Amino acid sequence: XWXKXKXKXWX
Amino acid sequence: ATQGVFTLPANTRFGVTAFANSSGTQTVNVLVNNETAATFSGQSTNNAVIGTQVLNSGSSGKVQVQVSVNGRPSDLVSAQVILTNELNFALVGSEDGTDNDYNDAVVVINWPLG
Amino acid sequence: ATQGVFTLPANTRFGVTAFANSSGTQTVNVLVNNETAATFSGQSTNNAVIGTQVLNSGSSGKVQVQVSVNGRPSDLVSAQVILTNELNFALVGSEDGTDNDYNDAVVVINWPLG
Amino acid sequence: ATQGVFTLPANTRFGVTAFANSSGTQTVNVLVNNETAATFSGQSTNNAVIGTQVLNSGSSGKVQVQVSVNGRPSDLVSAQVILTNELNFALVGSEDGTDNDYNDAVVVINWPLG
Amino acid sequence: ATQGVFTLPANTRFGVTAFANSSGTQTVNVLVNNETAATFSGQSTNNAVIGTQVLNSGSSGKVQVQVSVNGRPSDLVSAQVILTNELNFALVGSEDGTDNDYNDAVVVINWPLG
Ligand SMILES: *C(=O)C[C@@H]1O[C@@H](C)[C@@H](O)[C@@H](O)[C@@H]1O
Ligand SMILES: *Cc1cccc(C*)c1
Ligand SMILES: [Ca+2]
Ligand SMILES: [Ca+2]
Ligand SMILES: [Ca+2]
Ligand SMILES: [Ca+2]
Ligand SMILES: [Ca+2]
Ligand SMILES: [Ca+2]
Ligand SMILES: [Ca+2]
Ligand SMILES: [Ca+2]
C-alpha cells in the first residue's frame, strides 16, 4: 500500500 | 509460466497453511479440481497464520492457489520440493505491490499427512 | 549429512512453524546461536500447527531445528529453496518410527517477513 | 515474477551447463553483472549438453540466464535449492512454444566448485 | 534418511549427468529397478562433466544414484524440485572426505525430455 501512511494503514 | 498449480496424488489428504506479511488484507483461495475448497482472509505484517486446513485432493489431484488483495490478483511464485522421496512441499509466494518481496501471502501445502 | 541446520542472513527475523503427523507427541526445539529460542510440543495425526513463532537469526545467522519424541531424537531431512531470488523457505521433515513418511514433525522456516 | 536471475556469493567460481529438448535451435546467454559471459547453442530433442563452462560471479554476484529461439525470447521458470546448507543449485527451465514442457532449454548452475 | 533414490513416472526417459570436484576419481552408478544402467568415472577439480546419458525409468520408475571413490561409498544428499508443475530435477551431491562441500560428485537427473 503506502507504508504506514502516518497512522491509518491501508485505507 | 503458470504458478500456484500443483498435481498431487489423487484422493490424498493434504495440509494448506497461509501466512501474511503485508499492510493489505490477503484473500487466499484454494481450488481442488477447479472448485473452491477453502478460503482464508486476514492481515498481518508479522507472518501471522491467517488460515490452516486439511483438504482432500480428490479424483483429479489438481490443487490451485490464488491470492488477491481487495480484488487485485497477486502475482504468484511457486515450486514443489520432495525430501527423501517421500515428503512433499508445494510452496507459494505472492506479491501485492511493487517492492518484490513476494511474502505478502505465503502458502505452504504439505503431504502426506497422518 | 547434517540436516536441519540453516545459515540465514544475520540479524534477520524469520517465521518458524511446526506441524505434527504421528501418534507420538512431538517436541520441536528451534535453536538460534546454539541456544533454544522456541519450543513446541503436541500430538496430532491431522497436521495440527503445534506452534508458530517469529525469531531473530542473531549475529551468526545459524538456525537449527531438532525434533524428539519423549527424549528420543528423530531422524531429520531438510533443504532450502529460494523463489524469484527473494523468498526463502527452509524445510524440515522428521521420522520417529519405521514407516519412513518423514512427516511426524514437519517444520517450515520462512523469510523475509514484513 | 522475474525468473532466471540469481544472487550468488560474490567472487565465486560456479558451473553453468545447458541442455536442449526442442526441435528449435536454442541460444542460452549467461550474464554476469549484466554483461554476457557465456553463450551456448544447439538443437536436440534428447537432452544434449550444448554447453558447460566455469565462470566467476564477480564483485556483484549477479548471474542471469536468458534463452531465445531464432531471436524470440523463451518464457523462463527458475528456483534455487540448497542441500545440507552447503551445496547450491540454480535451476532454469524455458518454453519456446505451446506445449509447456519447459524443458526446451534447461540450465543448471552449481557451486561451490573444487 | 535414505538419499539418492527417486520415484520417476514409470517408463519415462530421463537425462542423467555427472560433474566432479575432487582430487579423487569419482565412480557414479545409476540403478534402474535395482540394476545398474549407467556408470560414469572421472576426475576433476573444475566441475568437468564425467558422464551424461539418457535412461528409461522402467516399470517401477525407481532410480538410484550411488557414488564411490577408491572403493568407498560417498555420503549423499539429495532432493527433487518441480518447476511450473512440469519440469523435474532430481539432484544429488556427495562427499568423499572431511571438508563437507558435498560437490565431489554432483549428479543431475532431469525429465521430461523431448
Ligand atoms: C503497501 O504498503 C505494500 C505492502 O505492505 C508493506 C507493509 C510490505 O509488506 C509490502 O511488501 C507489501 O507489498
Ligand atoms: C494503500 C492504499 C490503498 C487505497 C487507499 C489508500 C489511502 C491507501
Ligand atoms: Ca510485497
Ligand atoms: Ca511484504
Ligand atoms: Ca513416521
Ligand atoms: Ca507420520
Ligand atoms: Ca516446449
Ligand atoms: Ca521440449
Ligand atoms: Ca568434499
Ligand atoms: Ca570437493
Coordinates of C-alpha atoms and ligand atoms in Angstrom, one line a residue:
Chain A
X1 CA 0.0 0.0 0.0
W2 CA 1.7 3.2 1.2
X3 CA 3.7 2.1 4.1
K4 CA 2.2 3.2 7.5
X5 CA 0.6 6.3 5.9
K6 CA 1.4 8.2 9.1
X7 CA -1.2 6.3 11.3
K8 CA -4.0 5.0 9.1
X9 CA -2.7 1.9 7.3
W10 CA -4.4 0.5 4.2
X11 CA -7.4 2.8 3.6
Chain B
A1 CA 4.6 -19.6 -16.7
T2 CA 1.7 -20.8 -14.7
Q3 CA 2.3 -20.7 -10.9
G4 CA 0.4 -21.9 -7.9
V5 CA -0.9 -25.1 -9.7
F6 CA 0.1 -28.5 -8.4
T7 CA -0.7 -32.1 -9.3
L8 CA -1.0 -34.0 -6.0
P9 CA -1.5 -37.8 -5.8
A10 CA -5.3 -38.3 -6.2
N11 CA -7.6 -38.8 -3.2
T12 CA -4.9 -37.7 -0.8
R13 CA -5.3 -35.6 2.3
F14 CA -3.0 -32.5 2.4
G15 CA -2.4 -29.5 4.6
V16 CA -2.7 -25.9 3.5
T17 CA -1.4 -23.1 5.6
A18 CA -1.3 -19.3 4.8
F19 CA 0.8 -16.6 6.3
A20 CA 0.5 -12.8 5.8
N21 CA 3.3 -10.2 5.6
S22 CA 1.6 -7.0 4.1
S23 CA -0.4 -4.0 5.1
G24 CA -3.1 -5.3 2.7
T25 CA -5.7 -7.9 3.7
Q26 CA -4.9 -11.1 1.9
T27 CA -7.5 -13.4 0.4
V28 CA -6.3 -16.9 -0.3
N29 CA -8.4 -19.3 -2.4
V30 CA -7.6 -23.0 -2.6
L31 CA -9.2 -24.8 -5.6
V32 CA -9.5 -28.5 -5.9
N33 CA -10.4 -29.8 -9.4
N34 CA -11.2 -26.1 -10.3
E35 CA -13.7 -25.7 -7.5
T36 CA -13.1 -23.5 -4.4
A37 CA -12.4 -25.8 -1.4
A38 CA -11.1 -23.3 1.1
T39 CA -10.8 -19.5 1.5
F40 CA -8.6 -17.7 4.0
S41 CA -8.6 -14.0 4.8
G42 CA -6.5 -11.9 7.2
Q43 CA -3.9 -9.1 7.6
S44 CA -0.5 -9.2 9.3
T45 CA 2.9 -7.7 8.8
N46 CA 4.4 -10.3 11.2
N47 CA 3.8 -13.6 9.5
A48 CA 0.6 -14.5 11.3
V49 CA -1.2 -17.6 10.2
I50 CA -4.3 -16.4 8.5
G51 CA -5.7 -19.9 7.7
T52 CA -4.9 -23.6 8.0
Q53 CA -7.0 -26.5 6.9
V54 CA -6.8 -30.2 5.8
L55 CA -8.3 -30.9 2.3
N56 CA -8.5 -33.9 0.0
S57 CA -7.0 -33.7 -3.5
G58 CA -9.9 -35.7 -4.9
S59 CA -10.1 -37.7 -8.1
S60 CA -8.1 -35.3 -10.2
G61 CA -5.3 -34.3 -7.7
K62 CA -5.4 -30.8 -9.2
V63 CA -4.8 -28.1 -6.5
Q64 CA -4.6 -24.4 -7.3
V65 CA -3.8 -21.5 -5.0
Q66 CA -4.9 -17.9 -5.9
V67 CA -4.2 -14.8 -3.9
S68 CA -5.8 -11.4 -4.2
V69 CA -5.9 -8.1 -2.2
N70 CA -9.3 -6.3 -2.4
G71 CA -9.9 -7.7 -5.9
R72 CA -6.4 -7.2 -7.3
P73 CA -4.9 -10.5 -8.2
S74 CA -1.4 -11.0 -6.7
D75 CA 1.5 -12.3 -8.7
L76 CA 2.5 -15.8 -7.7
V77 CA 5.7 -17.7 -7.5
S78 CA 5.8 -21.4 -6.7
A79 CA 7.6 -24.7 -6.7
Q80 CA 7.3 -28.2 -5.3
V81 CA 10.1 -29.9 -3.3
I82 CA 10.3 -33.6 -2.3
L83 CA 12.6 -34.7 0.5
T84 CA 13.9 -38.3 0.9
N85 CA 11.5 -39.3 -2.0
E86 CA 8.5 -39.2 0.5
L87 CA 7.8 -35.7 2.0
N88 CA 6.2 -33.1 -0.3
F89 CA 6.0 -29.4 -0.1
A90 CA 4.1 -27.2 -2.5
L91 CA 5.2 -23.6 -1.9
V92 CA 3.6 -20.3 -3.0
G93 CA 4.7 -16.7 -2.5
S94 CA 2.8 -13.7 -3.7
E95 CA 3.3 -10.0 -4.4
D96 CA 0.5 -7.4 -4.0
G97 CA 2.6 -4.3 -4.9
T98 CA 6.0 -3.2 -6.3
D99 CA 8.5 -4.0 -3.6
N100 CA 9.0 -7.6 -4.9
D101 CA 9.4 -9.3 -1.5
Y102 CA 6.8 -12.0 -2.6
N103 CA 5.9 -12.7 1.0
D104 CA 2.6 -10.8 1.1
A105 CA 0.8 -14.0 1.4
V106 CA 2.9 -17.2 1.8
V107 CA 1.1 -20.5 1.3
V108 CA 2.5 -23.9 2.3
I109 CA 0.9 -27.2 1.1
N110 CA 2.3 -30.4 2.6
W111 CA 1.6 -34.1 2.2
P112 CA 1.3 -36.9 3.1
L113 CA -0.4 -36.4 6.4
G114 CA -1.1 -38.8 9.3
Chain C
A1 CA 25.0 -35.4 6.1
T2 CA 23.9 -32.9 8.7
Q3 CA 20.3 -31.9 8.3
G4 CA 18.1 -29.2 10.0
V5 CA 20.9 -26.6 10.2
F6 CA 20.5 -23.4 8.2
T7 CA 22.5 -20.3 7.7
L8 CA 20.2 -17.3 7.5
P9 CA 21.3 -13.7 6.8
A10 CA 22.4 -12.4 10.2
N11 CA 20.1 -10.4 12.5
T12 CA 17.0 -11.2 10.4
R13 CA 13.6 -12.0 11.6
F14 CA 12.1 -15.3 10.3
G15 CA 9.0 -17.4 10.8
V16 CA 9.1 -20.9 12.1
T17 CA 6.1 -23.2 12.1
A18 CA 5.7 -26.8 13.2
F19 CA 3.2 -29.5 12.1
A20 CA 2.5 -32.9 13.7
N21 CA 1.5 -36.2 12.0
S22 CA 2.2 -39.0 14.3
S23 CA 0.7 -41.0 17.2
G24 CA 3.7 -39.8 19.3
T25 CA 4.0 -36.5 21.0
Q26 CA 6.4 -34.3 19.0
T27 CA 8.9 -31.9 20.7
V28 CA 10.3 -29.3 18.3
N29 CA 13.2 -27.2 19.5
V30 CA 14.5 -24.3 17.5
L31 CA 18.0 -23.1 18.3
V32 CA 19.5 -19.7 17.5
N33 CA 23.2 -19.2 18.3
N34 CA 23.1 -22.7 19.7
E35 CA 20.5 -21.9 22.3
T36 CA 16.9 -22.9 22.3
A37 CA 14.8 -19.9 21.2
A38 CA 11.4 -21.6 20.6
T39 CA 9.9 -24.9 21.7
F40 CA 6.6 -26.5 20.6
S41 CA 5.0 -29.8 21.7
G42 CA 1.9 -31.7 20.6
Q43 CA 0.4 -34.8 19.2
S44 CA -1.7 -34.9 16.0
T45 CA -2.3 -37.2 13.1
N46 CA -4.1 -34.4 11.3
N47 CA -1.3 -31.8 10.6
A48 CA -2.0 -29.6 13.7
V49 CA 0.1 -26.5 13.8
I50 CA 1.7 -27.3 17.2
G51 CA 3.4 -23.9 17.2
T52 CA 4.4 -20.8 15.1
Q53 CA 6.8 -18.0 16.2
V54 CA 8.8 -15.2 14.8
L55 CA 12.5 -15.3 15.8
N56 CA 15.7 -13.4 15.1
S57 CA 18.6 -15.2 13.4
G58 CA 21.1 -13.3 15.5
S59 CA 24.7 -12.3 14.8
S60 CA 25.7 -15.7 13.3
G61 CA 22.5 -16.4 11.4
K62 CA 22.8 -20.0 12.5
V63 CA 19.4 -21.7 13.0
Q64 CA 18.9 -25.4 13.9
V65 CA 15.8 -27.5 14.2
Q66 CA 15.7 -30.5 16.5
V67 CA 12.8 -33.0 16.9
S68 CA 12.4 -35.6 19.6
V69 CA 9.6 -37.8 20.9
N70 CA 9.8 -38.3 24.7
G71 CA 13.5 -37.5 24.6
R72 CA 14.4 -39.8 21.6
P73 CA 15.8 -37.8 18.7
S74 CA 14.0 -38.2 15.4
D75 CA 15.8 -38.6 12.1
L76 CA 15.8 -35.3 10.1
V77 CA 15.7 -34.4 6.4
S78 CA 16.0 -30.8 5.1
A79 CA 16.6 -28.4 2.3
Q80 CA 16.3 -24.7 1.4
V81 CA 14.5 -23.3 -1.6
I82 CA 14.6 -19.7 -2.9
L83 CA 11.8 -18.4 -5.2
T84 CA 12.4 -15.4 -7.6
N85 CA 15.7 -14.8 -5.9
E86 CA 14.0 -13.2 -2.8
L87 CA 11.6 -15.6 -1.0
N88 CA 13.3 -18.2 1.2
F89 CA 12.0 -21.5 2.7
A90 CA 14.0 -23.8 5.0
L91 CA 12.2 -27.1 5.1
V92 CA 12.5 -29.9 7.7
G93 CA 10.9 -33.3 7.9
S94 CA 11.4 -35.9 10.6
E95 CA 10.8 -39.6 11.3
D96 CA 10.1 -41.0 14.8
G97 CA 9.5 -44.6 13.7
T98 CA 9.7 -47.2 10.9
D99 CA 7.2 -46.2 8.1
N100 CA 9.5 -43.5 6.6
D101 CA 6.8 -41.0 5.9
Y102 CA 9.1 -38.3 7.4
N103 CA 6.1 -36.1 8.3
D104 CA 5.9 -36.9 12.0
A105 CA 7.0 -33.4 12.7
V106 CA 7.3 -31.0 9.8
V107 CA 8.9 -27.6 10.3
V108 CA 8.9 -24.7 7.8
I109 CA 11.1 -21.6 8.2
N110 CA 10.4 -18.6 6.0
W111 CA 12.0 -15.2 5.5
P112 CA 12.0 -12.3 5.0
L113 CA 9.0 -11.1 6.9
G114 CA 7.0 -7.8 6.9
Chain D
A1 CA 7.8 -12.7 -11.3
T2 CA 11.3 -12.2 -12.6
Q3 CA 12.9 -15.6 -13.4
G4 CA 16.4 -16.7 -14.3
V5 CA 18.2 -14.1 -12.0
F6 CA 20.3 -15.4 -9.1
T7 CA 22.4 -13.7 -6.5
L8 CA 25.5 -15.9 -5.9
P9 CA 28.1 -15.3 -3.3
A10 CA 30.4 -12.7 -4.9
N11 CA 33.8 -13.6 -6.4
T12 CA 32.8 -17.3 -6.5
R13 CA 33.5 -19.9 -9.3
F14 CA 30.4 -21.7 -10.5
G15 CA 29.5 -24.1 -13.2
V16 CA 26.8 -23.4 -15.8
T17 CA 25.5 -26.2 -18.1
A18 CA 22.7 -26.2 -20.7
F19 CA 20.6 -29.0 -22.1
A20 CA 18.3 -28.9 -25.2
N21 CA 15.0 -30.6 -25.7
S22 CA 13.3 -29.0 -28.7
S23 CA 13.0 -29.0 -32.4
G24 CA 14.1 -25.4 -32.2
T25 CA 17.7 -24.3 -32.0
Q26 CA 18.3 -22.9 -28.5
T27 CA 20.5 -20.0 -27.7
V28 CA 21.4 -19.6 -24.0
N29 CA 23.0 -16.4 -22.8
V30 CA 24.6 -16.3 -19.3
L31 CA 25.2 -12.7 -18.0
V32 CA 27.4 -11.8 -15.0
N33 CA 27.0 -8.3 -13.7
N34 CA 24.7 -7.6 -16.7
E35 CA 27.4 -8.5 -19.3
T36 CA 27.4 -11.6 -21.4
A37 CA 29.9 -14.1 -20.0
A38 CA 28.9 -17.3 -21.9
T39 CA 26.7 -18.3 -24.9
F40 CA 25.6 -21.8 -25.7
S41 CA 23.6 -23.1 -28.6
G42 CA 22.4 -26.4 -30.1
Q43 CA 19.4 -28.4 -31.3
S44 CA 18.4 -31.7 -29.8
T45 CA 15.3 -33.4 -28.6
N46 CA 17.4 -35.8 -26.5
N47 CA 18.9 -33.6 -23.8
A48 CA 22.2 -32.8 -25.5
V49 CA 24.7 -30.9 -23.3
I50 CA 25.0 -27.9 -25.6
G51 CA 27.5 -26.2 -23.3
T52 CA 29.2 -26.3 -20.0
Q53 CA 31.6 -23.7 -18.6
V54 CA 33.2 -22.5 -15.4
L55 CA 32.6 -18.8 -14.6
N56 CA 33.2 -16.3 -11.8
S57 CA 30.3 -14.5 -10.2
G58 CA 32.4 -11.3 -9.8
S59 CA 32.0 -8.4 -7.5
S60 CA 28.2 -8.3 -7.7
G61 CA 27.4 -12.0 -7.6
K62 CA 24.6 -11.3 -10.1
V63 CA 24.0 -14.1 -12.6
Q64 CA 21.2 -14.0 -15.2
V65 CA 20.2 -16.7 -17.7
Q66 CA 18.3 -15.8 -20.9
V67 CA 17.1 -18.2 -23.6
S68 CA 15.9 -17.4 -27.1
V69 CA 15.0 -19.4 -30.2
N70 CA 15.7 -17.7 -33.6
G71 CA 15.7 -14.3 -31.8
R72 CA 12.4 -14.9 -29.8
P73 CA 12.9 -14.9 -26.0
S74 CA 11.6 -18.0 -24.3
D75 CA 9.5 -17.9 -21.2
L76 CA 11.6 -18.8 -18.1
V77 CA 11.0 -20.6 -14.9
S78 CA 13.6 -20.9 -12.1
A79 CA 14.5 -21.6 -8.5
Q80 CA 17.5 -22.1 -6.2
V81 CA 17.9 -25.2 -4.0
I82 CA 20.5 -25.7 -1.2
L83 CA 21.3 -29.1 0.2
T84 CA 22.9 -29.7 3.6
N85 CA 23.3 -25.9 3.9
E86 CA 26.3 -26.0 1.6
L87 CA 25.6 -27.3 -2.0
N88 CA 23.8 -24.9 -4.3
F89 CA 21.8 -25.4 -7.5
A90 CA 20.3 -22.6 -9.5
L91 CA 17.8 -24.1 -12.0
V92 CA 16.2 -22.7 -15.1
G93 CA 13.6 -24.1 -17.5
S94 CA 12.4 -22.5 -20.7
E95 CA 9.5 -22.8 -23.1
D96 CA 9.8 -21.8 -26.8
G97 CA 6.3 -23.0 -27.9
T98 CA 2.9 -24.1 -26.8
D99 CA 3.2 -27.5 -25.1
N100 CA 4.5 -26.0 -21.8
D101 CA 7.0 -28.8 -21.1
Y102 CA 9.5 -26.0 -20.1
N103 CA 12.5 -28.2 -21.0
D104 CA 13.3 -26.7 -24.4
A105 CA 16.5 -25.3 -22.9
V106 CA 17.3 -26.4 -19.3
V107 CA 20.1 -24.6 -17.4
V108 CA 21.8 -25.8 -14.2
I109 CA 24.1 -23.6 -12.2
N110 CA 26.1 -25.2 -9.4
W111 CA 28.5 -24.1 -6.7
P112 CA 30.9 -24.3 -4.9
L113 CA 33.4 -26.0 -7.2
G114 CA 36.7 -27.6 -6.4
Chain E
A1 CA 17.4 -40.9 5.8
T2 CA 17.8 -42.7 2.5
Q3 CA 19.2 -40.3 -0.1
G4 CA 19.8 -40.6 -3.9
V5 CA 16.6 -42.6 -4.6
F6 CA 13.9 -41.1 -6.7
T7 CA 10.5 -42.3 -8.0
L8 CA 10.1 -41.2 -11.5
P9 CA 7.0 -41.7 -13.6
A10 CA 7.2 -45.3 -15.0
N11 CA 8.8 -46.0 -18.4
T12 CA 9.9 -42.4 -18.8
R13 CA 13.1 -41.3 -20.5
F14 CA 15.3 -39.0 -18.3
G15 CA 18.7 -37.4 -18.5
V16 CA 21.5 -38.1 -16.0
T17 CA 24.7 -36.0 -16.0
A18 CA 27.6 -36.1 -13.5
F19 CA 30.2 -33.5 -12.5
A20 CA 33.4 -34.0 -10.5
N21 CA 35.0 -31.6 -8.0
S22 CA 37.6 -33.7 -6.1
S23 CA 41.2 -35.0 -6.2
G24 CA 39.7 -38.5 -6.1
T25 CA 38.4 -40.4 -9.1
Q26 CA 34.6 -40.5 -8.9
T27 CA 32.6 -43.5 -9.9
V28 CA 28.9 -42.8 -10.4
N29 CA 26.5 -45.7 -10.8
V30 CA 22.8 -45.2 -11.8
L31 CA 20.5 -48.0 -11.0
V32 CA 17.1 -48.6 -12.5
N33 CA 14.8 -51.1 -10.8
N34 CA 17.8 -52.1 -8.6
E35 CA 20.1 -52.9 -11.6
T36 CA 23.0 -50.8 -12.8
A37 CA 22.0 -49.0 -16.0
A38 CA 24.9 -46.5 -16.4
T39 CA 28.3 -46.0 -14.9
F40 CA 30.5 -42.8 -15.1
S41 CA 34.1 -42.5 -14.0
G42 CA 36.3 -39.4 -14.0
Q43 CA 38.5 -37.0 -12.0
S44 CA 38.3 -33.2 -12.0
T45 CA 38.6 -30.3 -9.5
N46 CA 36.9 -28.0 -12.1
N47 CA 33.4 -29.4 -12.5
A48 CA 34.1 -31.4 -15.6
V49 CA 31.3 -33.5 -17.0
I50 CA 32.3 -37.1 -16.3
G51 CA 29.3 -38.6 -17.9
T52 CA 25.9 -38.0 -19.5
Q53 CA 23.3 -40.4 -20.7
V54 CA 19.6 -40.9 -21.4
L55 CA 17.9 -43.7 -19.5
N56 CA 14.4 -45.3 -19.2
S57 CA 12.9 -45.3 -15.7
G58 CA 11.2 -48.7 -16.5
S59 CA 8.2 -50.4 -15.0
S60 CA 8.9 -49.3 -11.4
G61 CA 10.2 -45.8 -12.0
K62 CA 12.8 -46.4 -9.3
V63 CA 16.1 -44.6 -9.9
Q64 CA 19.0 -44.8 -7.5
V65 CA 22.3 -42.9 -7.7
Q66 CA 25.4 -44.3 -5.9
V67 CA 28.8 -42.6 -5.8
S68 CA 32.1 -44.2 -4.7
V69 CA 35.7 -43.1 -4.5
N70 CA 38.6 -45.6 -4.2
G71 CA 36.0 -48.4 -3.4
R72 CA 34.3 -46.4 -0.6
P73 CA 30.7 -45.1 -1.0
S74 CA 30.4 -41.4 -0.6
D75 CA 27.8 -39.8 1.7
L76 CA 24.9 -38.5 -0.4
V77 CA 22.5 -35.6 -0.2
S78 CA 19.5 -35.3 -2.5
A79 CA 16.2 -33.7 -3.2
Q80 CA 13.6 -33.4 -6.1
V81 CA 12.3 -30.0 -7.3
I82 CA 9.4 -29.4 -9.7
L83 CA 9.0 -26.1 -11.6
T84 CA 5.7 -24.9 -13.0
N85 CA 4.2 -28.3 -12.2
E86 CA 6.0 -29.9 -15.2
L87 CA 9.8 -29.6 -15.1
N88 CA 11.6 -32.1 -12.8
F89 CA 15.1 -32.1 -11.3
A90 CA 16.4 -34.9 -9.1
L91 CA 19.6 -33.5 -7.6
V92 CA 22.4 -35.4 -5.8
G93 CA 25.6 -34.2 -4.1
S94 CA 28.2 -36.4 -2.5
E95 CA 31.1 -36.1 0.0
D96 CA 34.2 -38.3 -0.2
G97 CA 36.1 -36.8 2.6
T98 CA 36.0 -34.4 5.5
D99 CA 35.5 -30.8 4.2
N100 CA 31.8 -31.3 3.6
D101 CA 31.5 -29.4 0.4
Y102 CA 29.3 -32.2 -0.9
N103 CA 30.3 -31.4 -4.5
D104 CA 32.8 -34.2 -5.0
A105 CA 30.4 -35.8 -7.5
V106 CA 27.3 -33.8 -8.4
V107 CA 24.6 -35.6 -10.3
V108 CA 21.6 -34.0 -12.1
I109 CA 18.6 -36.0 -13.3
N110 CA 16.1 -34.2 -15.4
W111 CA 12.8 -35.1 -17.1
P112 CA 10.7 -34.9 -19.2
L113 CA 12.9 -35.0 -22.3
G114 CA 12.0 -34.3 -25.9
Ligands
LIG1 C1 1.9 -1.4 0.9 O1 2.3 -0.8 1.8 C2 2.8 -2.5 0.4 C3 2.8 -3.8 1.1 O2 2.7 -3.8 2.6 C4 4.0 -3.5 3.1 C5 3.9 -3.3 4.6 C6 5.1 -4.6 2.7 O3 4.7 -5.9 3.3 C7 5.0 -4.8 1.2 O4 5.8 -5.9 0.9 C8 3.5 -5.1 0.8 O5 3.5 -5.3 -0.7
LIG2 C1 -2.7 1.5 0.2 C2 -3.9 2.4 -0.1 C3 -4.9 1.9 -1.0 C4 -6.1 2.7 -1.2 C5 -6.2 3.9 -0.5 C6 -5.3 4.3 0.4 C7 -5.4 5.6 1.2 C8 -4.1 3.6 0.6
CA3 CA 5.2 -7.0 -1.3
CA4 CA 5.5 -8.0 2.3
CA5 CA 6.7 -41.8 10.6
CA6 CA 3.5 -39.9 10.2
CA7 CA 8.2 -26.8 -25.2
CA8 CA 10.5 -29.7 -25.3
CA9 CA 34.5 -32.9 -0.3
CA10 CA 35.1 -31.1 -3.5

